[PDB]
Amino acid sequence: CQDVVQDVPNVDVQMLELYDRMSFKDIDGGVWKQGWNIKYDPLKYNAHHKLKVFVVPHSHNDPGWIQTFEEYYQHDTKHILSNALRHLHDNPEMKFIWAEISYFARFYHDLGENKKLQMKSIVKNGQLEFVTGGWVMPDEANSHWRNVLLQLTEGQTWLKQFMNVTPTASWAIDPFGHSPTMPYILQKSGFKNMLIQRTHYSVKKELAQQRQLEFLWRQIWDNKGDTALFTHMMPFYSYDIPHTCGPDPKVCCQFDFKRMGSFGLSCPWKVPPRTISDQNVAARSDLLVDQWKKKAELYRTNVLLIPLGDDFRFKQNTEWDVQRVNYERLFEHINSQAHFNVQAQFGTLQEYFDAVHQAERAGQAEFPTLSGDFFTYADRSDNYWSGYYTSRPYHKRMDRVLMHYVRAAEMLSAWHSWDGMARIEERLEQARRELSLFQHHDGITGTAKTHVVVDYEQRMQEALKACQMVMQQSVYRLLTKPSIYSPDFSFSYFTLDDSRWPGSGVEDSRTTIILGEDILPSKHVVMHNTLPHWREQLVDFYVSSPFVSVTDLANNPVEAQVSPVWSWHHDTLTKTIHPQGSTTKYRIIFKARVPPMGLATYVLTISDSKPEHTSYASNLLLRKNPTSLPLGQYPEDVKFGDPREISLRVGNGPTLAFSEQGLLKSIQLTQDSPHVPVHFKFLKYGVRSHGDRSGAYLFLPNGPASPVELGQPVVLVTKGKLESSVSVGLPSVVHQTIMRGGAPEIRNLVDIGSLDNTEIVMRLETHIDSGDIFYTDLNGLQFIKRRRLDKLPLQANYYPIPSGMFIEDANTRLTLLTGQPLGGSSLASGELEIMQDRRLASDDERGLGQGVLDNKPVLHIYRLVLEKVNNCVRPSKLHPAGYLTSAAHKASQSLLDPLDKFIFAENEWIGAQGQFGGDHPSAREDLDVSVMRRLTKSSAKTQRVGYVLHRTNLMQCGTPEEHTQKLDVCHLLPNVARCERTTLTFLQNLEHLDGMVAPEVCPMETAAYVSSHSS
Ligand SMILES: CN1C(=O)[C@H](O)[C@H](O)[C@H]1CN[C@@H](CO)c1ccccc1
Ligand SMILES: *[C@@H]1O[C@H](CO)[C@@H](O)[C@H](O)[C@H]1NC(C)=O
């Protein structure tokens, strides 16, 4: 195993180092506005060294943006694909690349057999080539790596089955900035090349000057370079035709033959395209070849990529003709005029890469090595695209919830083979596809129109319901005596209970367990643990009486706590935000202990009075002018008092102090230790009143944030033996700090209401001497060092926070883990901040054509981990990575993959069993079974089950935590007959494994295995 901590990789370009050195000056470079006037030696090219030019027709098809997926499919994409089929069939030298398999699958399944066969033939023959082959072309900022893999696998599995192809070149022309998580997954999915486009205009200029636009992109910790993937960065402002032929868009636009008038298009540079004729072809070729030769100067080989396309291009028959015929006339002239020393043709992306590497092998170029990322993107001036790290935060959080329900549903149902009548494969396919669709760079990014956002939400809601149906059928099967098991596949044996989604105060949707002497004495509940290690975790249920006690299925008493059910209401009468307590339902909380990848059953039982093993929380309402708060049968009266500082400690964990406004002020780790200043504060950013306006994409604040005026907010303190909390009703935010004996959990119920042109930020203020350094994660996969740069505007120092961020000095670290991707930064030493929501009246001129005024209440969740790190083995000051501790990693897992909770629906569960998976290996804490997926239907003689295994890297801080069992996924199911290592998409076998044993993976590695079973 490579050491990912102690060896700083030696690379030609390291992006944090490059950032430190660059000036980022935005000067007018001429026709290439963000570059310089390119010059070339006309004599570079000659009879023995020609420029080989590949013109690659393409059509960027967004799976939802201004229209829904289906509206675009009906109005544009079905015609593009239909006419591609006809035009490529009829013109054998014409070529076309296709990226978005969600659309291609929608189209293909509507084709007659005659046309399916024509389509297979133009793919087989190389005229139509798929690039990447994902369901979509995903966002790279907000997306979790698990879901990037999911959507890649969904599209590539479809391509292998129906088109018999697996792309090895990736095409990512539109995500707003780019992440090294992409080459990481792609290189472990068989890819050999990838292309990116949207990177900061200063980076394009800098890399172009050094001919470093093509590079071997390796991970920031990778000393050897085995993760490296060849990458092509496009050099110019856009992937459209004006910005892809060469440096001067006034010239390139004359070669977009759709822009002549009848198509309702024109050239902003005021010179139209002209049809190519025998009389003008020489002149036109001399303009175009000059553009090509200038572009060629920015790259190292004599092979040149010229994309030819734009959004939803190549629709009309007349458009296919006008592009193809004019380019054929140019190629014929250019290729026949020796003085140009060019050979130009239509080509595919793979053709371009193959020729580049032929040039490399011929010794004509060596490519530089690069590590780091390409955030935060700016396309011009100070227009940094950090706004979309937060836009539509409700769906950003929904993404993480569905991420987990997909994994759990696929896992739970993988243990058995299911009859076709069970509709298990059917429901899982719908769930995977709706989640995969939302990875699109207008989905999770929150940059689609209101009605399109609604479509994605409805689609995800259907996916959640599909997951629940699969999960609960699976649980009933796994925990019922087999000779009693009698499934109705439409029936709800269990309902899922989820405490954090949509969340209290977002949707009243949790069911109460209704118990009573005259109705039902007891109720079975079941917890599922998707992680491959034993887990204890507090779980809570709503119940109809405070007098409930908990047992396991051996009837052992389990300690429980009952609290009230509290909801916060904006009282239009008193103009206050204050809590109301239920008089009919209560919360019961207890510790569930669940096997690795397993299930555990508990029983809740009512009695007429306080049970022995159930305690009751006290509740203290702090506000001047209190009124009574009756709580039904709840046995402890609520106490009242004026606002005041408070301190709490659960178990033997940290002691937290709060301000009289209910916000954290300090954490004391142990009985002896200092009360370390850790202050939560809410602030607001506004919008500029002159110049460019913030919108869905751009963050353009009118200065540093200003404190939210809090007034005298109402504070609720609930204190229990198992769980305590402080909750406060702030303007736009009900802010809750929850304590269960370790790192606190923070929940924010965020309702920005009608505050237009406002972004609400949550900031932490500490005395950690972090300087200008902070750490943020990429796609939930790795933590990258950031350096705050005062030479850049505030918005440029915002980065994606897809799952976590931290600051540290020599002794102390604070980590904030998230349950949803949001934007954030560290704008001064000792600070962390993370945006909660943003409501923007204006459009930001990127094509969306609206502000963001469709906000809705969202429950954001966090864990907050303050730790001593002076004893940890940390990377050197020059290493570009950072690593979590054990506690912070577990805290992240608690947010993203909690225990699932199931309530038995019927009155009696005959044949119920107490546990499943007690004999599953409890793997080392840095290892996860990220994916468990049965890959065969029940008719297959040889069953196959796929696993994706991910090992993270946790700091060594002198806490052994030792003795664990080896996890061999190939023996999780009986009668194993074969075990293979595969690509992460399961589509290619890489290694046949001795003794049918899957080896565990190295830190920061991810592997896939498929076990085969003869049963
Ligand atoms: C920023 N964008 C998005 O959010 C979409 O994904 C779209 O493809 C892309 C914009 N494409 C450009 C054209 O190349 C465009 C710009 C304005 C209006 C229409 C399209
Ligand atoms: C699938 O593709 C491979 C590529 O080499 C080929 O050998 C095989 O015959 C193809 N299967 C078909 C044509 O169905």
Ligand SMILES: [Zn+2]
């Ligand atoms: Zn796009």
